[PDB]
Amino acid sequence: PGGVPGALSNQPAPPN
Amino acid sequence: GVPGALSNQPAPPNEAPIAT
Amino acid sequence: PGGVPGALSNQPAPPN
Amino acid sequence: GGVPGALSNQPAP
Amino acid sequence: GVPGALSNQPAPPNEAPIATP
Amino acid sequence: PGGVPGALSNQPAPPN
Amino acid sequence: GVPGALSNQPAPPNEAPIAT
Amino acid sequence: SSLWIAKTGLDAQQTNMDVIANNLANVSTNGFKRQRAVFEDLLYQTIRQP
Amino acid sequence: DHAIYTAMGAASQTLNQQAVTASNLANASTPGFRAQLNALRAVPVDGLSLATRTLVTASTPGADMTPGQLDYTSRPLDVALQQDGWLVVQAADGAEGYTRNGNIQVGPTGQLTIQGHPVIGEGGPITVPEGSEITIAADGTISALNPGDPPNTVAPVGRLKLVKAEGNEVQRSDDGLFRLTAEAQAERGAVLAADPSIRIMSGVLEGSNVKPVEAMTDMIANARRFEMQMKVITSVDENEGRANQLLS
Amino acid sequence: ALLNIFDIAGSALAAQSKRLNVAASNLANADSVTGPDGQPYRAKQVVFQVDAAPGQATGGVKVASVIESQAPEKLVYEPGNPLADANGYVKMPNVDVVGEMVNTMSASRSYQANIEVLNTVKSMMLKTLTLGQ
Amino acid sequence: LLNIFDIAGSALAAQSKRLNVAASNLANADSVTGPDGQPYRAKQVVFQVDAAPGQATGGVKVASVIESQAPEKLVYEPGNPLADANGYVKMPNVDVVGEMVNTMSASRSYQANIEVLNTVKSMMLKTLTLGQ
Amino acid sequence: ALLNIFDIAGSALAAQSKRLNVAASNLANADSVTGPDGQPYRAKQVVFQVDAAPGQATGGVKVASVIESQAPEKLVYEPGNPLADANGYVKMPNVDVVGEMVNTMSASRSYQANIEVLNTVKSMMLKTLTLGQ
Amino acid sequence: ALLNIFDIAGSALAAQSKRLNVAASNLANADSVTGPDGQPYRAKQVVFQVDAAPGQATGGVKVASVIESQAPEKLVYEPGNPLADANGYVKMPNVDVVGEMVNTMSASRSYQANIEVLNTVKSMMLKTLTLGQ
Q: Among candidates C7, K34, K30, which has minimal Cα distance to I225?
């Protein structure tokens, strides 16, 4: 589907 | 209710208190 | 019952 | 009435 | 009377002396 | 017959 | 004539000499 | 606004500076009692009660 | 269209916080002063359907009770209290108030005052005999010696009322005096009895306790937050214009 | 019944103009100290109501009355100014400049929206007048 | 092209909601408490495709608003009533740069969608005069 | 003559200009010993009144007159000066420096705020006239 | 009526440009010693007049002349300079630095005001051609 748009998604995150 | 839809009942008065 | 538009009615009012 | 509009001619005539 | 009004008379000259005459 | 504008005519000088 | 008018004759050349 | 508050602060410190300058100018005067300036905050404004 | 009002509330409360900080800084030389704390509370607007708008309200949660630095003045009447200790004065409106200002003065009639407020001792305001030399002991005891009269004629006259109260039990009144909160008044009584465990130093005056580092950091933060809110206001102001002017 | 839009949007335009005028009057007197009667200037604000007579479903908007804003008067310590208090507390208006600027911007935007409504409504009335022709 | 009107309106609503969330987060960068005494946890909208009867392409709907799971910042103020047994007050995890960029991008998307809606409405208006 | 908003904001601009002029004149004469007649310079103050043309509704700002401050004139012991009194104290003006800089800053920011109000209103003014055509 | 405004504002722009050039010339040669001949640099000032070619009193501004100020020439004691007079003094110009910088800034601001006037009236004269069409 989709998730948080903008800053939170286009930022590297720990794998999970 | 889905936002932008139509309902026959009015929305309740909203309030933003500072201290519960 | 309407009221004052804009700044006065969109700032957190006193409790009572 | 008591308040003239912003787009009205100067209340002071 | 009020600053910015209309009058039929020119304003007097703006003299500013340094000493009392 | 207007004179010099600006600095010279806005300084206190004795009449001559 | 007037500083910004129209004339039929070119303006004389202007030169700036160091000393006269 | 905060402009008036800080201007009152500046005026108080200048006053204190003038008091100190007066005290230091009268070092050699015979029988001089030093002047000490104390300050008080003006009325507090309550906007909304707890 | 209503995010402009959220940002405007944030900017106005930033102005209020800056006013509080400037008022605190203006009293860096006020004797026995307690700085006013500031905190931005967040008020979430209730309603439907997706709760997104939360506004900002500035608040002053009590004051700061950290003691300041004591200036040693060779005068017997300037006194300084222990940490979390208060001198009692009769307030402006015939009531009771608490303070840290130990700059006790005397009048021609001999009554003790603080900022013009008479000091309250065991049995009502303390009055010293006219034109006497006064010494204050380390537990509130007051001794008076008449000028030129056997120094063997020094006798105590009264005792100052020194109380103990924390920040939670103390709220600042509009006249600069501190009083009991209602929740503290319900437990500790209307009038606080004297606390005998408090030592008082004579000859030292307590100054203000405003911290310059916190004030400067707060001013920088207020400036930056205000700029961010102005940017939000400007961004909202262009979009609405375009929208209406075009979708008409 | 597209003619009633004329009345609705005209009332809205007049009310928003009055609100903008009141906000500008408050802003221009933020630094005032005295009134015509010697009283300090009190910040004023309009009250918006639905311009609906009893039994009317939905109307435009109307300005009921102009009321003094509820806020503490700004106290200034200047016991040298000829106008003062018992303790030298000059009373200055309680105008919140940010609020007035935001109010001016909001009034202008709502005004422009109502103008667009009026324009498109007039275009539709002309097109309706060109129904069969 | 009325479905285009539905699409553009839903997308305008979604971008306005994101802008409002970002503005509320920016307001509360320094907030220390709420009404209940809990810290303000930054909000984030969730976008989802609104194509319930329109196969895999449709408008965007805001499914929910969720508190961000980034760890709360901690400030050592042992005198604060909200301080725990360790003396740490929880302050929000709002990233200023992220919120500013979110506001700017949401504004640009809002304007793009408005232009799309205007072009579509003009195309419909010209379609209304077919054959004449 | 002027539209109501134009008159209010222009009066605000003129009043702020007068206040700035008074502040500048005070800052210039901070060290003046004598005037043209032999009397010390006295710091000038400008008093803002609300020009409430209607009854208590709105109005711009007017300036009734420029008053002369009543504060203890600064005394400097210079017995050799011809303007020294019997005791020998020449009179220096009561112009405070910090207050005048604060006044200049405040007048400038009020001036700019009123300018922004006029600039904001202007677009709505020009867009009103497209309603008929 | 409105086409004359182009001539008026263009005359104003030319006059302010001339004043700015004179100010720049004064600043450039504040420390100058001699000209092409042996005479010092006398500071220049333009003369503004009201240019009304017809009889209707008012109009634009015109620069009647450029004059050299008759203020006393500064004298510096330099007897080894061949330019010195019998007493060994050299005539250095009487340029008022602060006055000329203020003249530069004021001329710039008046220049922009006339530019804004020209832009506005050009827009109005473009819009009047649309009249009823």
A: K30
